[model samples]
Target: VISSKQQLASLYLQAKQSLFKQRALSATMYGLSQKDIGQVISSDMEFYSPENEKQLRAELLSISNTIAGIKLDADITTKNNQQVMAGLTRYFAGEPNFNIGYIDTWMGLSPFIVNQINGPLIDIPRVMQNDQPITTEKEALDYIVRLGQFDKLAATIIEKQTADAAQNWLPSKVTLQGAIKYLKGFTSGSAEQHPFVNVFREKIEKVDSLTTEQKQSLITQVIAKVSQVVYPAYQSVEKASEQLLSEARSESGIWAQPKGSVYYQDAIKQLGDSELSPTQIHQIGLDEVARISGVMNEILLAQGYTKGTVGERMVALNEEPRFLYEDSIAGREELLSDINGYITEVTAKMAPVFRTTPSYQVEVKSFPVEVQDGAPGGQYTSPAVDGSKPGIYWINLRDMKANPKFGLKTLTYHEANPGHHWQIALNLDQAELPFLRRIAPYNAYTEGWALYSEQVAYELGMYENDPFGDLGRLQAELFRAVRLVVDTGLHDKRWTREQAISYMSEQTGTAESDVVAEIERYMAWPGQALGYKLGMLKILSLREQAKARLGDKFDLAEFHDVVLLNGAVPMAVLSRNVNHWLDNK
Candidate 1:
């Protein structure tokens, strides 16, 4: 039994080490700094070639088989082994085609190689600029080494998109246009002024160990690399994007591709980590939308904005001059600073509900200027495991009006403090959990907890003095509920892009332009949006059950520890774990 357990662990670590090493940005985000990890900071992109996929799948199979063979008394270790197998199985099902294994080129079962939102072209540079550590001289050298390999790494994306295009698997014209626009915008300025070049210039100046001459030398190499390789690489991708735009499809759903429906089904299954059908999810969404909108309507009425639909009243609320930032550089800075203040205020309240809080505080920053046009309004990036980097909460400042004062608090809570940074950093901080569990990317669990955290904050009286801020929380929930309907409608029911956009805008009172960008996001990544609402509902349901079962014995902080400290798992696994806690208690 010990040997079998050891073998399973060995395979898991092998896969983790190999994959993280190839993907330097991911490794750095996970805090595998070269100084401690003892591996050269890798310049290679994620292993996506068919040969690499076959090998990876074989390794996954070995882990799964080992899990199946091991039998032990019912325990956390045993349950975790099975959870690891279940996660690997989820990935196998997420494969877009059996001809290719799980490739970095794909996002959630998305069939297209390049899309408006994500792919190597956008993600690679963002991580390198934002997360890659340059605190040491070796790390600085590694940064330049990775930067020098830009063209070689990006060419693989070009090759994969071409191969996929030849097979008639193209993203929508809108998707292609977004990618092309981003690529052109990214490659537009002088190479020296490029973010890729500028990040190093700025960060290397902070490295005290580097001599002035060494810093200048490194900065010069970065400029040369960006000019000679990175800019040309982006241009190549832009040219390819333009060529592919001509053949791009007009329809938005994955239903347009072969086996597209099946892919979306698997996508929601894996993303939400639930067996609920699209129809069921959509119906739940419709019901929640009605309930939340009615509640919001009551709030709007009390606030004296009663003439229109809840969404319409909220739109008027958004237009209130006091609720909006000045839409200037100073306003953007103030907005970011206010977000940090929110984080500070909320952190003090966390002790009541979360026993296992992260030691590292999250930092707030603006989205890199290049991708803000295509980026989500807010996001969170995890800290390094070795404490080299703090977690980051990124807010997009492209349009200040898009982030109304009322909404900023809920957004801050969701992306930072008790939402992502809390749960994710705690997961990484776990010393007893297996490495795989510590880093599991169970979408439903993570996103659901973040959404649920929003409500928890409200319950903690976060918005007692501010009804409009409370309304923002409800509106945010309404937006996620809307996603459940639209994500399923677009891919499963074959709804048009405009149709989804219209429903979302009408229901959530979000800006039309923001609505359009969001709909396009759903178009590019099917079923991913469903996780937030479905996960939140499941969590709320479980909490209610625990309250009924345990009555006064139920401690909110202890319950949170049970859910979060187990690390991210499927919704089913989470329910089981919680029930086990109940049984033991």
Candidate 2:
């Protein structure tokens, strides 16, 4: 037990040392020079060693136990630390009749342990394109070394996944098919056209220290590695996937696992950042879907596209030729340019919304066409922490006709603007946060804020002249609300995968392919989709509270700063922080 006030803080510094030692990949991915933080050990190059996890978990228990025993002195710093530690308590604290172990936290088990290797999260073919151009001769070689090691990395992932199934930890058959298809795509592509091959070529050419002959030789070596090592590793994963799909049951959620109900409940508590039960989220989703549908009805009528149901009109609007780009190679470029312009527009406006804006530029890129089969409509990766690289917002424009212009604006703002790139860059740039807290994340907090950013854009008149664009915003919000229902329904209520997909289509009028993919994603990752809307609603609720209490004094900029500056906290912590803002006013 920690006996002194000083020892509690001392214990923390040592504990964090061990924590970062294992997960420096997170820091380095953001472009931190890990040499300054820690030595370049062999383990530093390896991300997930089954050998190290036990030691790290054991260390965590000791650290958390020390915090659990610490006696706080009566001081403001102690109070703040206590608030932070109370949340930490949820991860390690035992409750009677509750599941014990890391699986009970927000992280739960890894996708490998859970047998979900088929989705975008594990699609190594696409993920192998990892590069940020921070180049010295050492850095360039290190970059090549990492890509060269892809075979071993992929083999480790496959080994872990197969062992889980030896204990009967199989994925749903529905989820298995997607994984099989995603993996098979990588195996059949020509070695020259493989994504890793292309990425190696482009990035290697940029390393000016290397001679042209050396560059081509290394490129040849990496491509040979892709053919001899990476491609075969992917095929093995696909074969393993086929084994699961052929033999597994159709059961759709974590509830399929032993003690899966309690596991899901923990995820709910972790993600909602509230004590809300799955049933509560399900009910909230139904209520919000009904409400948003009413709003959509009014919009459809105003535009005289009122004959069909709102979902029907939205489906039709999705297919309307005038709302779509050219649906060819040139059309894809047009889609890319359209999204790029919105990101540029929002980059300049962020300072007016919040006095503190990140000094990073965000570029919109398209996911190479080959992997678009499984890529989400949009995704964001943060800038290199030291600003050596720009933030990236990748859009899948493989099928331009699949995305309407009205939808792209809100999607643009969500990924690039006051959304993910903004929040992440600002969080990384904040030197005041403890090193651990700077990267500490909450799904509800970060995702909810991105969703709220969409609303902020709407109020900023982003959709004023574009009524269809406004509907796009509402539909996107409605899609998240539906996720709350479908995720809870599949995980907690034991709905079949098909039933979940059908319900989403009936409610949202999403195209069948998109609906199926989203349902499978929810099935594979329980309680994750629930966080986006749950977080957004909490933020919106707090903003309304600020507006009511402060009246003329409610400065939007101050409120925005107060929310963003705290980094990511659970919804409860956020509310308390907002209360502090209100009281000080």
Candidate 3:
């Protein structure tokens, strides 16, 4: 019942407005500084509904159903239409008839809500979002004060978590323990050292208009807010974690949860947005692992790492003092600076192979110590809509050993220029794409493109200059391959957390702590890790087709353009679009 481009454009905002109304964090990600004084952004938990799951699903699906009813101008491939089609196609998932509400939280609805509640607490460090830096004293003061909003917002989280715990909606004992530990650590630090206070202080101090006395007074007040108000909120969650003790088990897979098979399969579909179920993915993992494993030693053996399996050699390489920076403040400092340098170094090399780029600058940073263990290994925060913020290349520095120098090159390329930062920056920078398509992400495309960037780096000779760097790249890929196995293993094949951890450790030679953290991450986030590998595989398929069809005419830059310039589309759409590119050429 849709007839025009105008229909799709207006309909698109229907869901986006719903999303913004549901979560304030959604709005802030746009990096709008004007709303800094408003309570709406702070008042809501930002996590999606603590509402009953079925009811919530119904509401979300209703919105989808409405959008789905609108037919579009099928022949139009204007940038606007391409971008709208990208989001609508996925949002509706072509199943427009909504019997009930569907997924929530932008990437389809999630059963995983604890992390959403934890969003406000753990995301405190990002408050000083360097892009769209705050300009005024009131703005700065209000920014820090809003963190205190958790004081008001905590009860809803507490109530929702208790309800979830009672209903058997909880992660296993292992994940709860880590979250508890993270919360404990969050509460453990001095108020002065708290990210809420420290991050604010660092940003606020840069304001030249603020007198020294004013700054110090605000710092003291902010620290009090962190200790007096913020810590208590997180501590309450830690207390609730005890409720999970008996119910929680050591099982690491989502399969351990109620309807876990359905849960994981749904997660897989949501993330992969593909028909491949867990079994197919599990087998895919096995095949890819075998293939990647097949060649890993060729490099390891040639690089004088001949003794152990490539995995083992990688572990030892991390242990080698020369490969590791000192585990001190200075080491982390050097590590951050070094990674920023790698981004610059790699960007220089990228010009030859790819024409379009995110172009905006990016920074590499270590997690605020408190949030490091709780955070993902490395993350890229997209720039603010206004360009006040550069893409943030964030890493976990829970320990320096987790990040060795060689591994960093691959990590840098993945999170910085060619990976998440670029993809997100390109989306943000793209004036042609619809707003949601630009900022809203599909893990498969967003993360998948990032992992594929690792390969692009290889093609661009990023790794040829350093074989060990290639090892790092391959190791990272291998780690993703291993994820397909274990993520499926735990969800479909009945893998225990211990089994997943043991399998990953043996296969990737990642540090045990990193492995433990990663497995717990999978436990918390089902089907998310699979996106990196699955997405990369699809990209390779598309690129190879481009290569075969175009031959000498195949320009990697133009191919890159077709893939990225259109914004992140579903794999099938991307594949179809690529075929169209070849035909036109």
Candidate 4:
């Protein structure tokens, strides 16, 4: 048993570390040095060819079977970690490899390579600027080498995207148009004026080891690469994108594609980790939305806004001028300051419910002005493994109205403290677990925990004496519930883009602009939005079961420790972990 355990652990680490390409792109978050990143990805980013993917599945399956054969005679922590490792290994090995025209990597099961938020055009450059360090000449040279290989990455994506198109599996018409717009916009103007060149120019200017002449030489090479290699690479994607748009299908859902219905069913099982059918998920949404709407209506009535439906009343509350930030530079700054203040306030108040807070800091920043319009309301990036970088909570200041002051606190809790940053930091702090357990991208567990964190803040009395704030939390919860409805509606029920957008807007009272962006996001990444609510519900259910079983001995902090320390596992594994804790108690 011990030998098998050691072998399984060894295989998992080797599997993760062998992907130098993954390490290079992710080193910044892990706080690895620029020199280290340079050493790992010395020249180019390797896209997963179909052959490589198939080989990887075989290796993972072998590891999965080995893990499954292990006896459960280890300590509780080790047992849970091994279970999570085995589950994830099986999860990836079993990824559906239907000849749906494109290969699905271990990353996920999305059909579109170039949606509004992701794809190489947006993702690669962001990593170069945000994650890639350029403090020395060696690092700068590494940048040039990687930049030169952008064409190769582009070629790989182009081939797969073209293949997908050939099978009549093109992205939605709106998605294709947005992707093309982003592609062209990325390559717009002279190569020297591009963000890639500009950000590199700014970073290299401060490298103390470089002589002025050497810096200029590097700059020249960068310009040459951008014009000759990078810009042309994006143009290649643009060509494929244009072709896709011309022949694109007008329908919004996966239902329109060949075997799309089967694919969505698999997506719900694979991505959401839920056995429930689409009809079941949709019904759950309807029930939750109605229950939440009732609670919100009572609050609105107490606040003396009893003139319309719950959605209309919330819209009125949002536009009351007193609830809005000034739509200017100073207001944006003040809003950011206030967001930071929420983290500070929440951290001081978390001791009663949370056993421990993360040692790392969570910094709040605004999205870049250029991309702010398209970005979500807020996002959280986890801290590096070595604490070299603080966790970042990014707020989109594109429209002040989109972020009403009343709603800011709930958003803060969800994306920052007691939410993504807190839960993730806690998981990463479990150094004793297998490395794979610490960083596994289980969307359902992570997002579900964040959603539940919002509720935790409320139960912890953060919203007391602030009915408006409580309303904000409830509204955010309602928004997620609506996601369950519209996501299923779009993909399962064959709802059009406009239909999804309208339902979300009417139910949540969100801005049409935000509504459209979110609806499109769901369309692009099918079955993903469903994870938040489903995950949250499962966590809540587990907590209730534990509380009921333990009676007077139930400890909120201890329950949280079991969940957090067990690492992010599948729903069944989560249930087992809780039950095991109960048995010992």
Clashes of each: 0, 1, 12, 0
lDDT of 1 by residue, 456-509 (tens): 999888897999999999999999999999999988898999999899998989
Model 3: weakest 10-residue lDDT segment is: 93-102
TM-score of model 1 (CA atoms): 0.93
Best by TM-score: 4
Candidate 3 Cα RMSD after full superposition onto the native fold (Å): 3.9
Clashing pairs in 1: none
What C-alpha lDDT do the candidate models reach, one value each? 0.78, 0.71, 0.71, 0.80
* lDDT (tens digit, per residue) of candidate 3 on 33-81: 3243233543234432345333444454565555556555465255435
TM-score of each model, in listed order: 0.93, 0.89, 0.88, 0.94
**Which candidate wins on lDDT?**
4
> What ranges in model 3 sit over 4 Å off?
1-3, 33-49, 52-60, 73-75, 78-108, 115-120, 128-134, 190-193, 210-224, 326-341, 369-377, 396-400
Displacement of the residue 504 alpha carbon in candidate 2, Å: 0.8
lDDT assessment of candidate 3 = 0.71
lDDT of 2 by residue, 117-188 (tens): 332225323333553342445654655565566566656555555655666666777667766776776667
Q: C-alpha displacement of 89 in model 2, angstroms?
A: 9.2
Candidate 1 minimal-lDDT segment of 10 residues: 100-109
Model 3 per-residue lDDT at 415: 86
- The digit string of per-residue lDDT tens for model 4 on 346-420 reads 888987778776677788888887667667889988787778767899999988878888899999999988899
